[PDB]
Amino acid sequence: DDWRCARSMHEFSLKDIDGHMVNLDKYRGFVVILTNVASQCGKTEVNYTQLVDLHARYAECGLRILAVPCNQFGKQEPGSNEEIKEFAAGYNVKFDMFSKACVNGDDAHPLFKWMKIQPKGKGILGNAIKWNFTKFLIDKNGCVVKRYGPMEEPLVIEKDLPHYF
Template sequence: MSGTIYDFSVRDAQGGFVSMEKYSGLVVIIVNVASYCGLTSSNYSELKALNDKYYERGLRIAAFPCNQFGFQEPYCEASVNTFVKEKFDFEPDLYGKVLVNGGIVIGKEAPLWAFLKQEQAGTLTNSIKWNFTKFLVDRKGKVVER
């Protein structure tokens, strides 16, 4: 694979599809999130701080709920949105639930996440190891850091 995140459309939190081209010219942190993880509070707090500091300079946070790791995101997107807004006073761009890793038993991974993992390999394997894995995307849609 080669290309940019702009080559993908993803399901939004309301079930519609949106092109990742909406981030053209912006810097994006794409992250798999979970509401009931030991890392939830620190990660959402840090993401909110980054958003508050850099939003006006073109940073966006694209949050993808994922229930793949310890079933720590069991609720629907509307519940996730309410949780993050009320607990952290934060409203990232929230998308539909995804599988960030695929396999025979667990199903097909989201194409965007397959692309992200190929563009920035992981340690030992390319798989996402847990909640709150982040990918930094530059203003041209290229994945520059994991």
């Protein structure tokens, strides 16, 4: 278990919102938007609305969205996994929700550690995830191809999807 040597997201496993260990090679052959989410961020409703919209219009094209709740940014995701799942159901979320985890620090999930050190997943002024709703566009092979900041709404990613379908 050395994430620094992994060469694809498919090498990692992640607990879904229902406590079941989802093992991420299932998304091989699919385009993946990976994002850390939160319930009480100012950009929560705008991100959830457009993630559901992008899913409804591009799921047939192979787009899969993976939402990982995180409480490391202003403690804006304090609810339990059961509460988070309910909250996501309020937005008619039909993409994949996962268990609340950490994206920064020593206790960060190995997937997010590997994602931040990718060439296209690197960040300016440091590689750490700055705030809620950072997005990582991931191709069919599990390699990070683009990283989007917390201020960029999900529809900004739409223009980049057709190149990887």
